[PDB]
Design a protein around this ligand. Structure first.
Ligand SMILES: [Cl-]
Ligand SMILES: [Cl-]
Ligand SMILES: [Cl-]
Ligand SMILES: [Cl-]
Ligand SMILES: [Cs+]
Ligand SMILES: [Cs+]
Ligand SMILES: [Cs+]
Ligand SMILES: [Cs+]
Ligand SMILES: [Zn+2]
Ligand SMILES: [Zn+2]
Lengths: 303, 303
């Protein structure tokens, strides 16, 4: 017995310098009509108002890492990081996380400086999210739309979309932080419209037969090569740069050191690097994430 | 009677989030050998240490707009912007500006999120700078190396390189702020080496015969389309994005509004837009600069 998704949010500016989501959220707040469908209206939300006003990723800490139950359930304090305070507001608005009052679905919009193209980022393999990705793939022949599965591996989910009963991140790159490209703005705007169309079809009872699809599952990160003092000793190798989701094979170059030497991948198997050279990840010690490409069977969603 | 250039500086991190210059300056500070030539050694300088440590363009104000004689000659104050304080240090180091103690040449390194490719930015048409550009063009067949002339039009020059008797900015894009690409790092490193080779040949007495070359001269800026509240109402049109230094003709699209309409260029003549969609220029109200392409005659530099 299918439950429609009637409480749906689209969040932008979770990171204040990722410009598509910032400007889409700002635009929809003045022009909500675009987010309405017959069965439901999506609420646009500017997730990090202060980082957005300042055009930076975050003020005190990364909002998209502050939505764990531990943070949300913490006793308030004047000294709390801004984004912890804001996370608690989002929990009031779209949660409380893990309870029956939480929103049905939150679509959280992101941009990356990595050449990811269009990808959906999910913290679990819930079949609805896979059907959604498949639907976007179908609506956009020739346009890659990949699903990146990032299981928290324990213990606590941490993202803004995790506050809702379900949700997903739409990530689009490459785009410099603080830069709004018309091409990505329009594409994201059209993909959001399609995601809302999908929710509408789902609500109206569309049968979604079982299928198989390739997805990418997080294996873990690789840091930039560093000096003893943890400064960069090199950066992403020219042959790896811009090649997100493409096979990286053992013995292939992953970094170029300032001293001139190549650093080769020393893994035992082929992996698929994602988020290659994201500005925001330098301080996180991630030059790229390794993923495994796996073919999964997606259960039917039938009335 | 030619005067050699013996006091030469290469400045990086004038803007703390432009990563090629940041990491080249950091690397050369530990490995200066690369900046030595028979007749002279270039001194590497990290221009904005605090913005660089924080990986942002500036802390209080843009350092590359703080080197006017007015700022440099201002009475110090605890309340002074950080970059005004730092500008005064650079004036002590490489100046004082407009006096005989100033450095012979400062090469200031920049990155832009605009697709400029390689360009040299000069605040005057001094023939040495044009010969330099021509030499780089010759050393790199097939690689555009364009000269952008940005006369202050009065009254005061404002850049870090303007502190020295002469100088120039080497600008390379596109690169996201906070991202270091190996390809641009190596290219800038090789161009710096060539600039130093040129200074060495000049010092050793190379004759530089007169020639003609095309350059681009600043006409002024065009702001993003804005709402009454000065927020973005659109961004750079997809047909203009990434097309720096290419002809923009009257009647051609320059912006795409969020409402869907195109904004067309309404100028009387063809211009050549530069710095199209630079992150740092949003707050400066510049979506691009208009330039005129002009063929100039460059005087010989003979012993
Ligand atoms: Cl489906
Ligand atoms: Cl990439
Ligand atoms: Cl020449
Ligand atoms: Cl551009
Ligand atoms: Cs509608
Ligand atoms: Cs790719
Ligand atoms: Cs040398
Ligand atoms: Cs170009
Ligand atoms: Zn993000
Ligand atoms: Zn700069």
């Amino acid at each position: 017995s299918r439950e429609p998704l009637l409480r749906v949010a689209v969040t932008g500016g979770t990171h204040g310098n990722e410009m598509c989501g910032v400007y889409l959220a700002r635009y929809w707040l003045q022009n909500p009509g675009e987010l309405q469908r017959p069965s439901f209206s999506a609420m646009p939300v500017l997730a990090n108002p202060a980082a957005t006003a300042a055009c930076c990723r975050y003020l005190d800490r990364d909002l998209n890492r502050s939505c764990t139950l531990t943070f949300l359930g913490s006793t308030a304090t004047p000294d709390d990081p801004y984004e912890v305070k804001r996370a608690r507001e989002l929990n009031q608005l779209l949660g409380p996380k893990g309870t029956g009052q939480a929103f049905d679905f939150t679509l959280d919009l992101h941009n990356t400086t990595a050449n990811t193209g269009v990808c959906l980022i999910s913290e679990s393999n819930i079949s609805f999210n896979l059907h959604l990705c498949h639907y976007l793939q179908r609506q956009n022949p020739g346009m890659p739309c990949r699903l990146f599965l990032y299981e928290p591996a324990g213990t606590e989910t941490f993202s803004v979309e995790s506050i809702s009963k379900n949700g997903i991140c739409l990530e689009m790159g490459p785009q410099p932080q603080g830069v709004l490209r018309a091409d990505l703005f329009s594409r994201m705007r059209a993909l959001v419209a399609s995601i809302l169309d999908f929710i509408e079809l789902f609500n109206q009872g569309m049968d979604l037969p079982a299928f198989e699809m390739d997805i990418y599952r997080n294996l873990g990160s690789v840091d930039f090569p560093r000096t003893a003092d943890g400064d960069l000793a090199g950066t992403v190798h020219p042959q790896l740069q811009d090649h997100d989701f493409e096979p990286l094979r053992p013995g292939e170059p992953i970094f170029k050191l300032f001293s001139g030497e190549d650093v080769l991948y020393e893994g035992d198997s082929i992996v698929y690097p994602v988020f290659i050279n994201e500005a925001a990840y330098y301080e996180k010690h991630v030059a790229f994430l390794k993923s495994e490409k796996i073919r999964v069977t997606v259960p039917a969603l039938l009335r």
